[PDB]
Amino acid sequence: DKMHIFVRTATLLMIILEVEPSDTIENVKAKIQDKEGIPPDQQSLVFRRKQLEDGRTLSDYNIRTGSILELVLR
């Protein structure tokens, strides 16, 4: 029984990530780097129109399993 979130982009297929509520946005950015090659300092993550800041965690943003994030380059 594990947690999955999703990352929507303009150009790529839906990305699936395996995460835990204690994971931070940098961790999520790091996992995005492994699957897509995009460097973390270039990524902006958005959940429900709210900017996701690297220091926080997913439980901070109330991101549950099955949530879909938005990714745009910065």
Partner 1 sequence: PLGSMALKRIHKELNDLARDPPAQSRAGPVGDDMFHWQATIMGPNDSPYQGGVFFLTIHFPTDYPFKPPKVAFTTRIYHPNINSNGSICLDILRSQWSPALTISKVLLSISSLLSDPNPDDPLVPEIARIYKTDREKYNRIAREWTQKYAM
Structure tokens at 58: 């997913």
CA distances from 42 to 38, 50, 56 (A): 7, 17, 17
Which residue number, 41 or 50, has a Cβ lying nearer to partner 1?
Answer: 50
Q: Using CB under 8 A as the criterion, which residues of the chain lie in contact with partner 1 when the complex forms? A: 1-4, 6, 13-14, 16, 47-48, 65-69
H/E element holding 31?
A: helix 25-36
Between residues 17 and 39, which has the closer beta carbon with respect to partner 1?
A: 17
Q: Which CB, 3 or 30, lies closer to partner 1?
A: 3
CB of 16 to partner 1, least distance (A): 5
**What is the number of other CB atoms lying within 10 angstroms of the CB of residue 1?**
3
